[model samples]
Target: GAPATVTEQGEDITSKKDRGVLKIVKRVGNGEETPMIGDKVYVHYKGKLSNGKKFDSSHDRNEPFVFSLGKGQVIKAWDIGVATMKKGEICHLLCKPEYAYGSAGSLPKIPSNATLFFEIELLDFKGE
Candidate 1:
């Protein structure tokens, strides 16, 4: 059987374009402030292709992924999505090819023009 479409499961949170990044909120956060551009943010994430096949995950390693918001340390979808997240918020980001690995995609795991889906939890963040 073919996998069900995950994109339809989330609310449309695309800020600019209809085909841009989509966000689905699974859990709301307790924090009052969202992370700023240079803040170091920590998160737990699980990544999958549009076919619903798993690619990467942070929970399995028991370590949270950390990165600087809006610095392009991660994909464009992440920079935009994660920046909107409150500390402790859990959301799913549906990334189009343009905001994801692009035409080339990531080697091995991600195929060319692949659409990526990520379930991410905003664990914490620190500003310098």
Candidate 2:
């Protein structure tokens, strides 16, 4: 591909290096605190493949997705991505396959080695 381009809120920033892991900030949080490993977080999110095909979304379901931080209870990317978030923060996580399902992706919805995009909102949490 022609390098890697990361654009957010009209501003454009490019990275030529392929470090294999990338994260983007969509919106900032107000609270100074963030979640830690073993903390339970209630979140609303939308996930899609790089082709713009949505695979999952809490927004459409009208229900939040709750998962514990760390503990390897969820996808590896989600663990790393949400760990950087605080209460009420919204951000986009661009996860490469290495940080996601890799060669063995979830069937039907997700393909192998697919780059995943997630717009996540940290609604609430416990055990902070």
Candidate 3:
């Protein structure tokens, strides 16, 4: 298949591949505050398959989701991506299976060894 050009913040993020991808879609401005391990992170997100099939959306529910920053509360991509976010930043994370649910996948909507895509927005957080 041929490749398609994608964008964020009105431009490209310059990625090597899915092994590590974090593109800032928008931001409120860089700040000293960034989420650390054990911080309670609140976010809004739209998660979909590579084929553009949506699996879940915190925005659709009209409520944000929350999880601890580290401690395996979420996927490896999220742990890494969210840590780099400042308050009110919106980003897209292209995660390979190993950084996500892996070979087994999350089941139900996420199939085995599938790549995942996310449009995430950092809403709020607490703790260190």
- Global lDDT scores for all candidate models: 0.84, 0.74, 0.74
lDDT of 3 by residue, 1-128 (tens): 11122222223222445444445455553576888789999999998887878899998898899999978889887887888788888877777677788889886899888777787899887995
Error of 2 at 34 (Å): 0.6
Candidate 3 C-alpha error for residue 6, in Å: 5.6
Clashes of 2: 0
TM-score of each: 0.90, 0.82, 0.81
User: How many angstroms is residue 13 displaced in model 3 relative to the true structure, after the best TM-score fit?
Assistant: 11
Tens digit per residue, CA lDDT, model 2, 53-91 = 899999999999988898887787788778877788887
Sorted on lDDT, best first, the list reads: 1, 3, 2
Clash count, one per candidate? 0, 0, 0
Q: Which segments of candidate 3 are over 4 A away from where they belong? A: 1-18, 28-30
- Model 2: residue 48 alpha-carbon error in angstroms: 1.2
RMSD of each: 2.3, 4.8, 4.2
Higher TM-score: candidate 1 or 2?
Answer: 1
Q: Whole-model lDDT for model 1 versus the true structure?
A: 0.84
Best by TM-score: 1
Pick by lDDT: which candidate is best? 1
Looking at model 2, residue 105 earns an lDDT score of: 92
Any residue pairs clashing in model 1, and if so which? none
Candidate that beats the other on lDDT, 1 or 2, i.e. the better one: 1
